[PDB]
Design a protein around this ligand. Structure first.
Ligand SMILES: NC(=O)c1ccc[n+]([C@@H]2O[C@H](COP(=O)([O-])OP(=O)(O)OC[C@H]3O[C@@H](n4cnc5c(N)ncnc54)[C@H](OP(=O)(O)O)[C@@H]3O)[C@@H](O)[C@H]2O)c1
Ligand SMILES: O=C(O)c1cccc(CN2CCCCC2)c1
Ligand SMILES: [Co+2]
Ligand SMILES: [Co+2]
Length: 159
């Protein structure tokens, strides 16, 4: 089971300036519950985006993808191809835009949070992958976050 997990604005934006341009604490709790115990795979920019206090993410096998042969990630395995990163019964690809694009052909599930903010796509933004017809989705109810934002969860699958 290779899965992808991300949160996006309706427009598809997931990242900007090395950060996520919103906060949604219920989504972090959801992210932790889905990924905990498993292997997590991330691009080097996403690893750099985690504050040192939170990296590696606890209780998970952290794997970082870089083309730098000598890249060091204290607390994580570093691999040179996505295919080398995928492990064991369950791996979650946790970002960012480049690594989601690379991992989608190997993915069976996507767990997606849609954040209802009118955040327009800007040049240089990291974007979520677009899911074609092979994906089947189940739509959750809209909810309101402690942060003030409206959001809903999608669970996508394919066989
Ligand atoms: N759910 C979310 O909303 C969410 C989740 C995670 C991240 N983000 C955001 O996403 C943004 C970062 O996404 P990104 O797309 O800019 O960078 P990224 O995908 O996180 O990492 C990009 C890096 O991965 C490595 N890489 C890419 N293709 C590779 C390949 N084929 N083989 C080996 N290594 C490869 C390179 O690292 P080297 O340059 O070291 O070779 C490349 O610079 C940030 O803003 C972050 O906050 C959002
Ligand atoms: O699971 C956790 O414990 C945790 C800790 C810090 C942040 C997050 C949310 N995500 C994680 C991967 C993309 C960047 C932001 C989760
Ligand atoms: Co699990
Ligand atoms: Co299945």
């Amino acid at each position: 089971m290779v899965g992808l997990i991300w949160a996006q604005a309706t427009s598809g934006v997931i990242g900007r300036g090395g950060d996520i341009p919103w906060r949604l604490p219920e989504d972090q709790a959801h992210f932790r519950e889905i990924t905990m115990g498993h292997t997590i795979v991330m691009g080097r920019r996403t690893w750099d985006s985690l504050p040192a206090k939170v990296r590696p993410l606890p209780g998970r096998r952290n794997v970082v993808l870089s083309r730098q042969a000598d890249f060091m990630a204290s607390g994580a395995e570093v691999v040179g191809s996505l295919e080398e990163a995928l492990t064991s019964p369950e791996t979650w690809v946790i970002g960012g835009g480049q690594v989601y694009a690379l991992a989608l052909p190997y993915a069976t599930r996507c767990e997606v949070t849609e954040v209802d903010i009118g955040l327009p796509r800007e040049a240089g933004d990291a974007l979520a992958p677009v899911l074609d017809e092979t994906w089947r989705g189940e739509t959750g109810e809209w909810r309101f976050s402690r942060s003030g934002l409206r959001y809903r969860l999608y669970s996508y699958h394919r066989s």
